[PDB]
Ligand SMILES: NC(=O)c1ccc[n+]([C@@H]2O[C@H](COP(=O)([O-])OP(=O)(O)OC[C@H]3O[C@@H](n4cnc5c(N)ncnc54)[C@H](OP(=O)(O)O)[C@@H]3O)[C@@H](O)[C@H]2O)c1
Ligand SMILES: Nc1nc(=O)c2nc(CNc3ccc(C(=O)N[C@@H](CCC(=O)O)C(=O)O)cc3)cnc2[nH]1
């Protein structure tokens with residue numbers, strides 16, 4: 001099974017200038033809990049944005065060019081990325097925009113955080129047809145002293 005996980009600001013913005021400008025520790029905790037001990041697939045730009053391997057996960061990087069770091073696994077196509085994960089129950093695709101576009105048709109589950117923040121961005125999450133997805137979990141949180149915007153965690157499953 002393939003799942004996508006992402007955090008979206010208003011208008012489905014996911015990034016700006018190869019960065020995420022907000023800081024929401026509760027969402028990073030949700031990301032870690034839902035990805036630990038699973039393989040994670042990311043594109044090369046997101047690998048450069050993160051800047052180091054994510055511990056406790058098999059890190060698979062999609063790039064058309066040879067890898068430059070043997071702490072992670074480099075693959076050259078979607079099919080190779082999937083095969084490199086082996087026979088696991090759940091593969092997590094962690095972006096960015098171009099990578100989400102390619103895996104969305106193959107995904108059975110979306111883990112989405114909706115952040116109530118207006119962000120100038122240059123990268124968006126793909127348009128997804130709402131009729132194809134059922135919301136199976138949602139949890140709203142007001143802003144607090146650690147998290148400066150309200151946010152909604154949602155899990156959707158393909159119908
Ligand atoms: N809010 C969130 O949840 C979230 C999550 C992830 C990322 N982001 C943000 O998203 C942005 C990065 O997104 P992005 O769309 O620019 O880039 P991306 O999807 O991270 O990376 C695209 C790169 O991945 C490689 N790639 C993608 N598909 C491939 C394929 N089929 N075969 C081979 N290589 C492939 C290519 O690398 P080569 O050029 O080396 O071939 C391509 O240029 C940043 O702003 C980051 O902060 C946000
Ligand atoms: N919901 C969600 N939030 C995100 O921030 C996110 N980020 C990415 C890509 N970028 C990043 C950037 C940093 C870290 C990171 O530092 N993660 C640590 C945090 C642990 C914690 O804060 O408790 C990790 O071990 O996962 C992960 C992904 C992809 N999907 C996401 N999905």
Ligand SMILES: [Mn+2]
Nearest residue numbers: 077078079080
């Ligand atoms: Mn092929």
Ligand SMILES: [Mn+2]
Nearest residue numbers: 083086087088
């Ligand atoms: Mn197999």
Ligand SMILES: [Mn+2]
Nearest residue numbers: 116117149150
């Ligand atoms: Mn806000």
